[PDB]
């Protein structure tokens, strides 16, 4: 059982896999190993978790700064916002699924 990371995340190499999607993040923190908060939503509306988030129980396994991470998620069709974090450093992007 781990605690969620309290630092800030980054959006590096932007991306599909004929259904699922992949995104790489960079954690600027030393509290590792913590749970990486990742989800999809429709934002400014109590970010209700939509989608599936395929990657199993993502955790920053090391206490070293600027670790890289591959995360694959199941975003819904249409426009969406891949949220990576929890708190005030929660980053958000935009997605569109094959319409």
């Amino acid at each position, epitope marked *: 059982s781990y605690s969620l990371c309290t630092a800030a995340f980054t959006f590096t190499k932007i991306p599909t896999l004929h259904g699922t999607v992949t995104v790489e993040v960079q954690y600027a*923190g030393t509290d590792g190993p913590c749970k990486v908060p990742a989800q999809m939503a429709v934002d400014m509306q109590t*970010l209700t978790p939509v989608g599936r988030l395929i990657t199993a129980n993502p955790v920053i396994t090391e206490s070293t700064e600027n670790s890289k991470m591959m995360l694959e998620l199941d975003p819904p069709f249409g426009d969406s916002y891949i949220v990576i974090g*929890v708190g*005030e*450093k929660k980053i958000t992007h935009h997605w569109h699924r094959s319409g």
Partner: antibody
Amino acid sequence: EVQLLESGGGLVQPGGSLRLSCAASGFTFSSYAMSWVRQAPGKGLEWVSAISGSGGSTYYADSVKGRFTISRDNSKNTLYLQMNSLRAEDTAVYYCAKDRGPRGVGELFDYWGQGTLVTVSS
Amino acid sequence: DIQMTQSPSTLSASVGDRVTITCRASQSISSWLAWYQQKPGKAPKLLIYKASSLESGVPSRFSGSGSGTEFTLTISSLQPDDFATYYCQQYNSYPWTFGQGTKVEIKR
């Protein structure tokens, strides 16, 4: 109407234990993260511990780690802080503050209670 | 532990004057920085988050600025109820550390 009310403090011998409570009332507790911040009399604010809205995540300060335990009872809208190995330097007014944003980690302390005093001495 | 140190430790000024408090970090924390006010015997109050964003209810004379390492809190025109001790806090990472404070006093 965010009202917070700390309870459960007072005088305890060094090495003893005491547990604080905090009855939150004016917001959806099952959605916001709460923290414990203390203030030694005559000094500044030191951060003690913070817990998540679900309780799955719980953070502590090094001077406190392995001796205190933060807990939550989302059914009764109260928040606790179990202090089991109190020393003299833990003498402070302990505050119960709530995250400025729901489903967070305790980055900011939006509302504060007035506190409860713990004096650890022989 | 990110070290917040404020400056100065004690301020004296008269009503109407502009006062500026300072807070330097041990490392770069972009804009993750709050400010609180504490009146003697009362609990602290959140005044400004993310460096320059005022919290609802805080007057317009309070303003915030700064990024990375050096942030300042400014009161455009000191008023008789603005005298308190002011703390600094970075929430860039855990454990959320504070500064030592800055006591604003009224000249007369």
